[PDB]
């Protein structure tokens, strides 16, 4: 649709309530940024099908979730022409549509507190190492492959770019990535030809895209939190039912004090992760610009 074609280049951007038009949207954002004959289309929707029904009817880490960062990760991608390659392009698009896949609305900290078999298998971003085996899963279905026409070199190369961008969205990462780029942009080292270097920036972009929703307008913003803190919540029931007191963001008796968690969540993690973004890619500024805008009104909330 019109309306669409226009909003979708918004950083702001909300996706919508019709879940049988995102596969769509996805499909465009994939065709717009990497060209329309490098996936069969055939085998791109059957992909995107799969990696639907692999995800789960959570209240936030949920299909809606997926594409949404997909949409932020093609809105930074789309105004930074020429920075990345064509294979980063596809692999970031892709790793941003499977990087929550089969997430149940726990965090690591639960599932090893639980001692679930995942954290025996995983023991560290537990949860984005099991993300990541599902999309190679998937990736290894019949007719599902595809990155197929790709060279077995730049299969693998596609694979690590994928497994990287879904391991930077364990945010245990963010705040030592974070710290070491500020370093780097403070001293004028940073070199994107670096690989080393340009796998942090990679790790930030996604940081930047998995929080995109305090870059929204207020209105959307404010939607999503709920989504968020249910899941949280019902975490720290868990974490009681374990006879373990949880803290105070996942317990429900704590939710006079949201006002105060966000202004904290703001300061420590979102201002932060947007500044050294627009640092390093001065075109994403609206998504700083947007942030700034929550925090003021997550303070006019305290007053
Ligand atoms: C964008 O979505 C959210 C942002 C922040 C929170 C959050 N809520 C609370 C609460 C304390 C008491 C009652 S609620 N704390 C946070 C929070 C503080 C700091 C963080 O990172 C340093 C991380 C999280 C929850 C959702
Ligand atoms: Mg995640
Ligand atoms: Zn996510």
Same mark, same amino acid.
């Given at each position: 649709?019109?309306?669409?074609?226009?909003?979708?280049?918004?950083?702001?951007?909300?996706?919508?309530?019709?879940?049988?038009?995102?596969?769509?949207?996805?499909?465009?954002?994939?065709?717009?940024?990497?060209?329309?004959?490098?996936?069969?289309?055939?085998?791109?929707?059957?992909?995107?099908?799969?990696?639907?029904?692999?995800?789960?009817?959570?209240?936030?880490?949920?299909?809606?979730?997926?594409?949404? /960062?997909? +949409?932020?990760?093609?809105?930074?991608?789309?105004?930074?022409?020429?920075?990345?390659?064509? =294979?980063?392009?596809?692999?970031?698009?892709?790793?941003?549509?499977?990087?929550?896949?089969? +997430?149940?609305?726990?965090?690591?900290?639960?599932?090893?507190?639980? @001692?679930?078999?995942?954290? *025996? =298998?995983?023991? &560290?971003? &537990?949860?984005?190492? +099991? +993300?990541?085996?599902?999309?190679?899963?998937? %990736?290894?279905?019949?007719?599902? $492959?595809?990155?197929? &026409?790709?060279?077995?070199?730049?299969?693998?190369?596609? %694979?690590?770019?994928?497994?990287?961008?879904?391991?930077?969205?364990?945010?245990?990462?963010?705040?030592?990535?974070?710290?070491?780029?500020?370093?780097?942009?403070?001293?004028?080292?940073?070199?994107?030809? $670096?690989?080393?270097?340009?796998?942090?920036?990679?790790?930030?972009?996604?940081?930047?895209? @998995?929080?995109?929703?305090?870059?929204?307008?207020?209105?959307?913003?404010?939607? &999503?939190?709920?989504?968020?803190? *249910?899941?949280?919540?019902?975490?720290? @029931?868990?974490?009681?039912?374990?006879?373990?007191?949880?803290?105070?963001?996942?317990?429900?008796?704590?939710?006079?004090? /949201?006002?105060?968690?966000?202004?904290?969540?703001? $300061?420590?993690?979102?201002?932060?992760?947007?500044?050294?973004?627009?640092?390093? %890619?001065?075109?994403?500024?609206?998504?700083?610009?947007?942030?700034?805008?929550?925090? $003021?009104?997550?303070?006019? /909330?305290?007053?």
């Amino acid at each position: 649709p019109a309306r669409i074609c226009r909003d979708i280049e918004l950083f702001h951007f909300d996706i919508g309530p019709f879940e049988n038009m995102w596969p769509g949207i996805f499909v465009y954002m994939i065709h717009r940024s990497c060209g329309t004959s490098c996936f069969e289309l055939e085998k791109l929707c059957r992909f995107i099908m799969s990696v639907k029904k692999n995800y789960r009817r959570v209240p936030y880490h949920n299909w809606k979730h997926a594409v949404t /960062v997909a +949409h932020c990760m093609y809105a930074i991608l789309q105004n930074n022409n020429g920075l990345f390659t064509d =294979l980063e392009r596809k692999g970031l698009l892709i790793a941003c549509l499977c990087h929550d896949l089969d +997430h149940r609305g726990f965090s690591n900290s639960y599932l090893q507190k639980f @001692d679930h078999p995942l954290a *025996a =298998l995983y023991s &560290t971003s &537990t949860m984005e190492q +099991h +993300h990541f085996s599902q999309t190679v899963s998937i %990736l290894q279905l019949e007719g599902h $492959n595809i990155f197929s &026409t790709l060279s077995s070199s730049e299969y693998e190369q596609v %694979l690590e770019i994928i497994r990287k961008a879904i391991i930077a969205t364990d945010l245990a990462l963010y705040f030592g990535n974070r710290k070491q780029l500020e370093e780097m942009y403070q001293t004028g080292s940073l070199n994107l030809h $670096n690989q080393s270097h340009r796998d942090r920036v990679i790790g930030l972009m996604m940081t930047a895209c @998995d929080l995109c929703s305090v870059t929204k307008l207020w209105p959307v913003t404010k939607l &999503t939190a709920n989504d968020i803190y *249910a899941e949280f919540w019902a975490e720290g @029931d868990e974490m009681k039912k374990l006879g373990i007191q949880p803290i105070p963001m996942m317990d429900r008796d704590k939710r006079d004090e /949201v006002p105060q968690g966000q202004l904290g969540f703001y $300061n420590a993690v979102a201002i932060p992760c947007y500044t050294t973004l627009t640092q390093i %890619l001065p075109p994403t500024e609206p998504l700083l610009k947007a942030c700034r805008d929550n925090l $003021n009104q997550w303070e006019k /909330v305290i007053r």
